[PDB]
Structure formats: C-alpha cells, structure tokens
C-alpha cells in the first residue's frame, strides 16, 4: 500500500526492502550492516528494532564514532568450486555515539546513545546539536581519579558536578531503600536530583549524618 518509494538512507528509489510495521523503506546495501539479498518472511527495519531511551534527554555532552557492527556473512553460491573462497562478508560502518545528560538524573547517570536513537526520540535537540557542531571529527574535550577521568571527566564533565554540596531531603521506597535529594556542587538547585543511598559518592556518609544532624 503506502511505503516510502525511496530509500530512507540515500533517498534513491528502485529495489526496496519494506518494513512490516512502519512505512520505512531501505536498500539492502544501505542497511548497517548491508544485506546480500531481500530476506523472506518478516523483516523489521532498524527503526522498529531501535532500543528505547532510559529517560528524557536534557543535554548532549560529547560524541564519538562507535565501532562498526559485525559484517553480514554471504552464503557460498550453490554452484561454487571447492577451491573458490567464500564471498567476502558484507562490511558495516561506524555510527555516531552520543554521551548524554538525562533529565532528572545527575551526571552520575550519563550514558551513551546512538545517533539512530536521538534521530527517533530527540530529533529537535539533535538537529540543533548538529547545527552547532562539526559532525565529521569528534571534539577532544590515584586510581579513583583515573576511573572517573576515564568514564566521566574526559567527556566534558566537571568533577564538581558529581560532588555533594548539600543533602536537601530524603525518601523511603516501597521496599525500604532510603533515597536522598542531592544538591550538587557548581550546579543550581533546579539540578538537584534524587540519588540512591547505595551510590558510591565521595563523602556520602559524611553528608548523610550532616543531613540528620540538621533534623536533630
Ligand atoms: Zn539507499
Ligand atoms: Zn520499521
């Protein structure tokens, strides 16, 4: 009935693989990784199989090129010579990866999402980010420090944004786990966020007892 008559990747027409649960259409050679032939039965396009975000995106911090997926293997043609090598597997390509700050979550919960995810679920924010950033080459900007530098700081996070300034309130789960509302250093109060009792925040215990002394 109604599918794109034109590839969602390159915007050309011709032999198109059409999704079974959305209007999208693709060339088999434009998928990542490419396909050697139109499969049979059900096919779900990369957009319908796209994982869901764990929350609302507040800010795109940095991006990097991710690793290409495993190539698509090509069956040997049925009339092949035993000495003929099997066809080269169909090579994929890198996709952009984005390190994001989540709405209502502290910089402890920053995590990576794909370009396909932002394109689907945060397209306004993402199209704004593309406009302000060179998207061809990513920007470049004590055991525990090396672990924090490696995971958070190198990606554009001030250490202070992950240090406690004040604990403002508490809450108890249905399961009895205590949760604390944390004001973070170098960030306004509207960036305070609920954090688990069990997160390994520097001096966590010292701010907990300071909070309860305030209740006295
Ligand atoms: Zn195409
Ligand atoms: Zn689809």
UniProtKB/Swiss-Prot annotation:
Miscellaneous comment text of the record: One of the main antigens reacting with anti-MI-2 positive sera of dermatomyositis.
Function: ATP-dependent chromatin-remodeling factor that binds and distorts nucleosomal DNA. Acts as a component of the histone deacetylase NuRD complex which participates in the remodeling of chromatin. Localizes to acetylated damaged chromatin in a ZMYND8-dependent manner, to promote transcriptional repression and double-strand break repair by homologous recombination. Involved in neurogenesis.
Comment on protein domains: The KIKL motif recognizes and binds the NET domain of BRD3.
Species of provenance: Homo sapiens
Disease affiliated with this protein: Sifrim-Hitz-Weiss syndrome: An autosomal dominant syndrome characterized by intellectual disability, variable congenital defects affecting cardiac, skeletal, and urogenital systems. Short stature, macrocephaly, hearing impairment, and facial dysmorphism are present in some patients.
Biased composition (Pro residues): 68-77
Protein's UniProt name: Chromodomain-helicase-DNA-binding protein 4
Chain residue ranges for the region called Disordered: 65-92
Covalent link Glycyl lysine isopeptide (Lys-Gly) (interchain with G-Cter in SUMO2), residues: 158
Zinc finger residue extent: PHD-type: 4-51
Modified residues (Phosphothreonine): 72, 84
Gene: CHD4
Protein family per UniProt: Belongs to the SNF2/RAD54 helicase family.
Modified residues annotated as Phosphoserine in this record: 70, 86
Span within the parent record: 446 to 676 of 1912
């Amino acid at each position: 009935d109604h599918h794109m008559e034109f590839c969602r990747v390159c915007k050309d027409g011709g032999e198109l693989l059409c999704c079974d649960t959305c209007p999208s259409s693709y060339h088999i050679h434009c998928l990542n990784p490419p396909l050697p032939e139109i499969p049979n039965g059900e096919w779900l396009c990369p957009r319908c199989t796209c994982p869901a975000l764990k929350g609302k995106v507040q800010k795109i911090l940095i991006w990097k090129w991710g690793q290409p997926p495993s190539p698509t293997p090509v069956p040997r043609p049925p009339d092949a010579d035993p000495n003929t090598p099997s066809p080269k597997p169909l090579e994929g390509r890198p996709e952009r990866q984005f390190f994001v700050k989540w709405q209502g979550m502290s910089y402890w919960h920053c995590s990576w999402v794909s370009e396909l995810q932002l394109e689907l679920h945060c397209q306004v924010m993402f199209r704004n980010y593309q406009r302000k950033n060179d998207m061809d080459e990513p920007p470049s900007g004590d055991p525990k420090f090396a672990e924090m530098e490696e995971r958070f700081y190198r990606y554009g996070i001030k250490p202070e944004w992950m240090m406690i300034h004040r604990i403002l309130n508490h809450s108890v789960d249905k399961k009895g786990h205590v949760h604390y509302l944390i004001k973070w250093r170098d960030l306004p109060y509207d960036q305070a966020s609920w954090e688990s009792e069990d997160v390994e925040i520097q001096d966590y215990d010292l701010f907990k007892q300071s909070y309860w002394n305030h209740r006295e």
